[PDB]
Design a protein around this ligand. Structure first.
Ligand SMILES: CC(=O)N[C@@H]1[C@@H](O)[C@H](O)[C@@H](CO)O[C@@H]1O
Length: 130
């Protein structure tokens, strides 16, 4: 599914993402916008290293989920990458929380560094009631 902006903001809030490990909801929204356009079924194959990015946060198979076809990969979220393609984003959120329990935090997604870091991200949650 493709979420509408404020629908996603409230969904993420109910799932406990506002301020998780210090990360504001607006940062999570900025991440989802630029990774996938709020699209839970999005996939991106990385021919360079044979990994694939999955779902609304475009979480990568080399480290975070298992798809069986990524060489020398691990599965730190202990999920099938299929779980990151559901309309219900609970599992994707659990995995995103696992990602940011590691040292880099939200910087684990390079797109966040390029599109959200040191930026005014307040627009992504304006009007959503969060
Ligand atoms: C949290 C996460 O999935 N990070 C991955 C990152 O580790 C990877 O090296 C990069 C390359 O496509 O894609 C994503 O940013």
């Amino acid at each position: 599914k493709v979420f509408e902006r404020c629908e996603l903001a409230r969904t993420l809030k109910r799932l406990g993402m506002d301020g998780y490990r210090g990360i504001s909801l607006a940062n999570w929204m900025c991440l989802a916008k630029w990774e996938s356009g709020y699209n839970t079924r999005a996939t991106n194959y990385n021919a360079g290293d044979r990994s694939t990015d999955y779902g609304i946060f475009q979480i990568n198979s080399r480290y975070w989920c298992n798809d069986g076809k990524t060489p020398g990969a691990v599965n730190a979220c202990h999920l099938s990458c299929s779980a990151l393609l559901q309309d219900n984003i609970a599992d994707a959120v659990a995995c995103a929380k696992r990602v940011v329990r590691d040292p880099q935090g939200i910087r684990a997604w390079v797109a966040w560094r390029n599109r959200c870091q040191n930026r005014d991200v307040r627009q992504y949650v304006q009007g959503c009631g969060v």
